[PDB]
């Protein structure tokens, strides 16, 4: 008589790796490395702002393409390749530091800073910022001398942050095409903008000169920014070439910002994003994009790491 012990097998096993062998056949296995993308931004349940043509820093200054974004509110901020921060050509100093502040801000809320002016004009415009006619940056003021060639009287303005979180403050310097044009806008002389607070110290002079035409303009606007702590004051001593802030920004809460070229999708949910979409997965690892942001499997170099979920397959000979 007889009785035998044994285990199971299959004609179709899966090879895996171990510490001692490469390509051992086991009964069953399963993948640890996520390969599969969803080519959409899965936004189900999230307050989402798709900036489209508005660049993220434009939400603070207000070029026309950002008019519907001046006080946005979001958990998920999406930047687009077609976005632009400017209408009149220019750029921000420490722009990317500011982009990272605004990506996690939960949005911004604006507040009049209450600057009032005297013997100057305040309605500088351009055809690079068209709202119907020629216009400017919605949150800013292009300050001139009161009439062609006149003196700019060295003014000072102050703003006290009377709120319990820090104030984002932004101003600009206008670099005219020439010192002739700088003179027609603000009068003659080396013009100096001084900006100070309880922890800030900097100064700026204009740099007239001819530049690459951008948006049909050879002049440029420098944009600068600082964070006013609660109960602190910011002070602007200036005599020309000054693009002044009309409103300050306060941050609403917290959010996440991504960059993408794929469509929003409110039918799927996901916490791991990249420019090409959403990594929905429970696997511990992914091989889709090492710059994926959010809550993600760890990025690894390998496309596949099979984890044995069965015994060694020893086939019936």
């Amino acid at each position: 008589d007889k009785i035998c012990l044994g285990h199971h097998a299959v004609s179709n096993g899966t090879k895996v790796n171990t510490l001692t062998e490469r390509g051992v056949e086991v009964v069953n296995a399963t993948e640890t490395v996520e390969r599969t993308n969803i080519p959409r931004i899965c936004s189900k349940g999230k307050r989402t702002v798709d900036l489209g043509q508005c660049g993220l820093l434009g939400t603070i200054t207000g070029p026309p393409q950002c008019d519907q974004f001046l006080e946005f509110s979001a958990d998920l901020i999406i930047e687009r390749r077609e976005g632009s921060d400017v209408c009149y050509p220019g750029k921000f100093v420490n722009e990317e530091a500011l982009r990272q502040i605004l990506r996690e801000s939960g949005g911004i809320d604006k507040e009049a800073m209450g600057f009032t002016y005297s013997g100057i004009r305040t309605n500088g415009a351009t055809s690079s910022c068209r709202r119907s006619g020629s216009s400017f940056y919605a949150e800013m003021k292009w300050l001139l001398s009161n009439t062609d060639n006149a003196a700019f009287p060295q003014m000072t303005k102050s703003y006290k942050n009377t709120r319990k979180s820090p104030a984002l403050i932004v101003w600009g310097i206008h670099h005219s095409v020439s010192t002739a044009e700088q003179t027609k806008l603000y009068g003659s002389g080396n013009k100096l903008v001084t900006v100070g607070s309880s922890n800030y110290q900097q100064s700026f002079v204009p740099s007239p000169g001819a530049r690459t035409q951008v948006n049909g303009q050879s002049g440029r606007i420098d944009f600068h920014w600082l964070m006013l702590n609660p109960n602190d004051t910011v002070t602007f001593s200036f005599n020309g070439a000054f693009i002044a802030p009309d409103r300050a920004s306060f941050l609403r809460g917290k959010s996440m910002g991504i960059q993408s070229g794929v469509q929003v999708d409110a039918n799927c949910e996901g916490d791991c994003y990249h420019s090409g979409g959403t990594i929905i997965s429970n696997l511990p690892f992914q091989n889709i994009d090492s710059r994926a942001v959010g809550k993600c499997p760890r990025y690894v170099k390998q496309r596949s790491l099979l984890l044995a979920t069965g015994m060694k397959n020893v086939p019936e000979i």
């Binding site: 097998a9 790796n17 640890t32 499997p297 390998q302 984890l307 060694k312 397959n313």
Partner: protein, 172 residues
Amino acid sequence: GLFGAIAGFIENGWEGLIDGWYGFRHQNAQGEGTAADYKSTQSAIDQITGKLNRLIEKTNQQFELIDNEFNEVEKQIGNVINWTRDSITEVWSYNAELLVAMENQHTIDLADSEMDKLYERVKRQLRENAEEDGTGCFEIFHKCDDDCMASIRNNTYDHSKYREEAMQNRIQ
């Protein structure tokens, strides 16, 4: 294997065994029969799904962007960032390969082990009334009709019942 069974002194799986990982196959006098052992099968299944529950793990750490694929950040900070991200990719790639190779070695070994445990349980169950043939089978030196085989399977075989008969059938 580490325990010399699931590719050792058994060295053949049964493609027929389609309702468990481990099974008894016997032939007495009423022909041959094959059954599963849900106890061992469930032990290996539970240990392995324990591994699975551990590794199909969802980290709660959010990471944000620190560079920019539309407007390249400044070159020196961008090279530090790239060098850091690449160093961490190296670390995680090593971790993931090692984790899976270690785990696979141990999965195969605990499957092997569950086999050895089951076999030993039956050997100890059959006491002096059987011999080890050396390929996974107990040569039983007394009559063992289907009922007796089921008593082996379901862990109720009483060695005292056949002890005299079987010992006598083994010696002379």
